[PDB]
Structure formats: C-alpha cells, structure tokens
Amino acid sequence: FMSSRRQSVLVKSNEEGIQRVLTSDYAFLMESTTIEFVTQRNCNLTQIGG
Amino acid sequence: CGIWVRTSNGGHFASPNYPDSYPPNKECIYILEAAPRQRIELTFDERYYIEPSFECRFDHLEVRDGSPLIDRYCGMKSPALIRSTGRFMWIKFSSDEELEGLGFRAKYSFICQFELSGADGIVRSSQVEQEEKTKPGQAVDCIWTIKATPKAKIYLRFLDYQMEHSNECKRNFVAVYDGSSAIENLKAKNDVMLKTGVGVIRMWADEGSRLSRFRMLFTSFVEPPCTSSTFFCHSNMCINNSLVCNGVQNCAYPWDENHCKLFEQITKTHGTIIGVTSGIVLVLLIISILVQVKQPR
C-alpha cells in the first residue's frame, strides 16, 4: 500500500507526521516509547493495538 | 565570482585576485557568448612563461565549446589560441583546497533556446510550433532557462511525462541541469529539487514531435527554512509571494493551494421547485377551503 501510494501517504520526520495525524485520519506508525510520550503529553491521540 | 562580458567586442578575463594568487575553494564558471556570425578570439597572455608546472587533475581549467569538453589544462602553461565557431565559449575555473598559485589571465575578443523565469510557471510540452517552428521530420531539441526570484532555489514537478518514442534515449530524452547551463553537472536525465537559483531544462527529440508531453512546473522561494509569514507547506518550503491557494498543486504535497476550499431548506436541484409549486397550489387550496369556512355563520 505504501509502495503504491509512494509519498501519497508518507512522512520524512516525526513532528510533521504528528500534525498530519492531528489534521486527518492518519496512522503514522511509530516506535512505542515516543508514542507513549506523545499520547501522555497530549490527550487527544492514543495508541491502538499492541 | 563569475565575470560576464556579454556584448563587448573586447574585455579582460583573469583569475580571481589575478596579480595575487587565486583564492582556494573557488568554483567559478565563465562564458564567452557571441552573436551568430560573430567569431570569438580567446587569448592567453602567460603571467609565468614555463612548461606547465603541476600537470594533474586538481586545479584544472576546463574549456567548453557549445558539451564536448575541448581540453583541461593545469600547472603553468598557456594553451595556444583556439578559434571560436560555436560562438558560445564556456570557461570553468576550479580551485582545490590546498594548491594555491599564480593564477591566470586571458583576453577575449569578438571577430532552440527560450527564456522562462519568474516565481512559477510551466514549460509547455513540445511547445515548438510557436517559438521556433521546426518541421517534425528532423530530430529536434531545445533547452529551457529558469531564473528564480532573488534568493530562491527552485523545485520542479513533472505534471505529464511520456517519451513513447523509445524507452531508450540514444535518440530522445529529457534532462535537467543545475547550476548554470553547461555540460558540467547533470542534475538528472520523478520531481527534482534545484540546488542553485538558475534552472536549465533541455529536451532532446528525434524523428517527429510524437513525444507525448513534457509538462512540468517550477516553484520559487523553495530554499528558505521558515521565517514565519509564508505557510509551512513542507520542510523549508516557505515560498509564498502570492501562491497561497493558486489553484495548482504548487507544493510537493497538497498544502498551499489545498485545504482552503438559509437556502439549506430549499437546496433541492429540481425537487425544491416541484415540491414548492405543489405546496403553493395546496396552500392556495387551503385558503379556498378557509374562505368557504369563514362563509357559514
């Protein structure tokens, strides 16, 4: 899916991906530790799955 | 660093700090540009008459006609005179990190390219039947010159690209050149980012204009990290002079020209009208019933 989209839904950093999630139904898979940090600093976006 | 000498029958050309030693870590490109049927005389006065000292591959001086590179000299010799018939002499001087010396002096004398610059625009594909109407039969090729707003590196995006004449390019290809328009550095022959501020687009075609299209867009103010006023379309892509919502995909991802774009009761395309008419008829009928009603006492 990402290969077909090929920058249609892709990101080159973290913060811009965070904002893209904040502005659209965006997944932005990330390593768990920073996800914990972000979802604790903010309170509107939380991790799903395991 | 470049010393342009356009439209002068004579003038002078020499290394930076010419009586002194050349500064290191230069990379300066030079041009002798002449009118058709205007022939160029290029001359080296030696400041230092000897057979060349450091004959090697750093600190070379290239010479470019049209780009078949005529030669590269180094050390401490003069090339003999070379007579110009291509009338567009391209001179590149390079400097290393740690070999610094007497420099050089020169004397020049006189004996399908279109302009396309600004902040934004599109190179019309196969746009040759208006600029330089070339018959389709022969191989055709043209170059395109971009110039950004002061202090602006450029980003390009191809909107339509199909060179069906052949997969291979020994006949037909499209390439991009960075820096100034020389054979010095092919940026590429996907979208592209120009490192410099002046753009060079050449296209080669053969046996017809059947090439489907080369239709692409160049962007300005692509260079700076954001000060503030222009929008953060992408990382250090604050560009706006007026292109905020210009109706064209003017950024790598949709940002600048995207995301900015009582009758609700009657918003039915035809339904509202038919229903309303039937309703008026009914209301009037209700009023008729009401008149007959206020009639009995």
Q: What is the dihedral of CA B164, B166, B171, B174, to 10 degrees?
A: 50
Best probe of the B interface among A5, A6, A7, A24, by most B CBs < 10 A, is A7
Token pair of A32 as six digits: 């768990």
User: What residues contact residue B52 under an 8 Å CB cut-off, 6+ apart?
Assistant: B73, B74, B75, B76, B77
Exposed/middle/buried for B250, CB within 10 Å: 0-12, 13-18, 19+? buried
| Chain A residues near residue B260 by CB distance under 8 angstroms | none
Residue B102: closest CA among B77, B81, B82, B79: B77
DSSP H helices in B66-172: none
Residue B70 φ then ψ, to 5°: -65, -45
Residue B147: closest CA among B200, B101, B111, B106: B200
Q: Greatest CA span in chain A, whole angstroms?
A: 34
Residue B203: closest CA among B256, B281, B124: B124
Interface of B with A in 239-258 (CB under 8 A): 252-253
Residue B33: closest CA among B93, B89, B108, B106: B89
A13 vs B: CB within 8 A: yes
What was the resolution (in A) of this experimentally determined structure? Answer: 6.4
Q: How far apart are CA B45 and CA B265, in angstroms?
A: 88
A33 vs B: CB within 8 A: no
Q: Which residues of A are annotated as a binding site for L-glutamate?
A: 31
Q: Greatest CA span in chain B, whole angstroms?
A: 133
3-state secondary structure B227-243: CCCCCCCCCCCCCCCCC
User: What residues contact residue B44 under an 8 Å CB cut-off, 6+ apart?
Assistant: B78, B79, B81, B104, B105, B106, B107
| Chain A residues near residue B234 by CB distance under 8 angstroms | 16
B235–A16: do the CB atoms touch at under 8 Å?
A: yes
Q: Which value, in Å, is the radius of gyration of the alpha carbons in chain A?
A: 11
A7–B235: do the CB atoms touch at under 8 Å?
A: no
Q: How far apart are CA B194 and CA B173, in angstroms?
A: 19
Residue B19 φ then ψ, to 5°: -60, -30
Q: How far apart are CA B112 and CA A24, in angstroms?
A: 47
- Determine the residue type at B143: I
| Chain A residues near residue B253 by CB distance under 8 angstroms | 7
Q: What is the DSSP letter of B18?
A: T
Token pair of B93 as six digits: 């001087």
Q: How far apart are CA B182 and CA B166, in angstroms?
A: 26
| Chain B residues near residue A16 by CB distance under 8 angstroms | 234-235
Beta carbons within 10 angstroms of residue B23's beta carbon: 14
Q: Starting at the edge strand that comes first in sequence, how are the strands of the sheet with B155-162 ordered?
A: B120-123, B213-219, B155-162, B192-193
Q: Which value, in Å, is the radius of gyration of the alpha carbons in chain B?
A: 32
Interface of B with A in 116-175 (CB under 8 A): none
The whole-angstrom distance between B253's CA and the closest CA on chain A is 8
| Chain B residues near residue A13 by CB distance under 8 angstroms | 235
How many residues belong to chain B? 297
The answer to whether B181 touches B200, Cβ cutoff 8 Å, is yes
- Determine the residue type at B158: F
Query: Which residues precede a break in chain B, with C-to-N distance above 2.5 Å?
Result: 66, 111, 189, 261
A13–B253: do the CB atoms touch at under 8 Å?
A: no
B252–A16: do the CB atoms touch at under 8 Å?
A: no
Residue B217: closest CA among B297, B124, B150, B126: B124
How many residues belong to chain A? 50
Residue carrying structure tokens 């080669």: B204
Q: How far apart are CA B176 and CA B161, in angstroms?
A: 13
Q: How far apart are CA B211 and CA B164, in angstroms?
A: 6
Q: How far apart are CA A14 and CA A34, in angstroms?
A: 10
The percent of chain B in helix, strand and coil, each rounded to the nearest 5, is: 10, 30, 60
Exposed/middle/buried for B239, CB within 10 Å: 0-12, 13-18, 19+? buried
A6 vs B: CB within 8 A: no
A13–B252: do the CB atoms touch at under 8 Å?
A: no
Q: Starting at the edge strand that comes first in sequence, how are the strands of the sheet with B105-110 ordered?
A: B10-14, B105-110, B40-43, B82-84
Q: In which element (H, E) is residue B12 found?
A: strand B10-14
Calculate the alpha carbon distances from B82 to B30, B39, B152 in Å: 16, 11, 37
Which residue of chain B is at minimal alpha-carbon distance from A23?
Answer: B259
Q: In which element (H, E) is residue B291 found?
A: helix B271-294
The answer to whether B142 touches B132, Cβ cutoff 8 Å, is yes
- Determine the residue type at B263: F
Q: How far apart are CA B155 and CA B120, in angstroms?
A: 10
